[PDB]
């Protein structure tokens, strides 16, 4: 085995609140004197089909919003919209507010979710932003408004908020400035995700992790070119590899003494011939939810 670890969640736990609007309850993020949650909290079951969020929000008063931080009712003194995120000004700055930034991540990048039920931390898991900007994850009992995050030194980088589930049962949401990842809208209408491809650079990081942990059967004599690798990659629904992806893998190459194009040759054969009933780090499938950065972090 080689464990998919989440970041420690403590700094995020102290920021999770319950947000209620009528019969709708979901999770909010309480930073300084502002609570962030999905704007679709202001919607009635009717409204969700084609909501006019400006008209719906104009109709709401400060007192239509119930914010609970543990046992404390917070006083809403202001309500506003940044894209698809509702911003509730409360009369108290969160005294547990960590140092934080809002970042927009790239498809293939990983992050931790603190899954919450009615403002209460329930669980933490590590996932990837799929190439089609969806998230495979949490069963979702009152999971709307649960946030994704990286910890960078002493700083929480908030990168994601859960808004909705798609037909396929994958999840979609926004950055903390309320812009969707992918072509999705907070409207109850049938919306297609792109083809979900495998994150090749992550699969290569994980083969590197397998070698570091002494799992070596899949190494072959062969090398390959980026060009010839990418033709095979595209046949099996794998993202094309670029020189930047080669450069990103450099530390794992140097540590293992296995060139990137030699590991690429190993992956090529695995795709063409399958695993012949064998496993790598105790998985029967190639794992793509570890970045090169994740493997380096955990192999130190």
């Amino acid at each position: 085995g080689f464990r998919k670890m989440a970041f420690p969640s403590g700094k995020v736990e102290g920021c999770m609140v319950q947000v209620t609007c009528g019969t709708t309850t979901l999770n909010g993020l309480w930073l300084d004197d502002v609570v962030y949650c999905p704007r679709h909290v202001i919607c009635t079951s009717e409204d969700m089909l084609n909501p006019n969020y400006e008209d719906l929000l104009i109709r709401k008063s400060n007192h239509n919003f119930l914010v609970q931080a543990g046992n404390v009712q917070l006083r809403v003194i202001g309500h506003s919209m940044q894209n698809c995120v509702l911003k509730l000004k409360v009369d108290t700055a969160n005294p547990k507010t960590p140092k934080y930034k809002f970042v927009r991540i790239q498809p293939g990048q990983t992050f931790s979710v603190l899954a919450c039920y009615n403002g209460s931390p329930s669980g933490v898991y590590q996932c990837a932003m799929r190439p089609n900007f969806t998230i495979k994850g949490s069963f979702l009992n009152g999971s709307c408004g649960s946030v994704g995050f990286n910890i960078d030194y002493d700083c929480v980088s908030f990168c994601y908020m859960h808004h909705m589930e798609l037909p396929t049962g994958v999840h979609a949401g926004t950055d903390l400035e309320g812009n969707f990842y992918g072509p999705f809208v907070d409207r109850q209408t049938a919306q297609a995700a792109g083809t979900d491809t495998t994150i090749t650079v992550n699969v290569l990081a994980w083969l590197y992790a397998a070698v570091i942990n002494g799992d070596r059967w899949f190494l072959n004599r062969f090398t390959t070119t980026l060009n010839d690798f990418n033709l095979v990659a595209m046949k099996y629904n794998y993202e094309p590899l670029t020189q930047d992806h080669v450069d990103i893998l450099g530390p794992l190459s140097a540590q293992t003494g296995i060139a990137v194009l030699d590991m690429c040759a190993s992956l090529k054969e695995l795709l063409q011939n399958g695993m012949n009933g064998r496993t790598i780090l105790g998985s029967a499938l190639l794992e793509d939810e570890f970045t090169p950065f994740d493997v380096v972090r955990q192999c130190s």
């Binding site: 709708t24 309850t25 979901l26 999905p38 679709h40 919607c43 969700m48 009152g142 709307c144 808004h163 909705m164 589930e165 798609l166 907070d186 109850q188």
Partner: peptide, 4 residues
């Protein structure tokens, strides 16, 4: 599905 945006329930909840």
């Amino acid at each position: 599905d945006e329930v909840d």
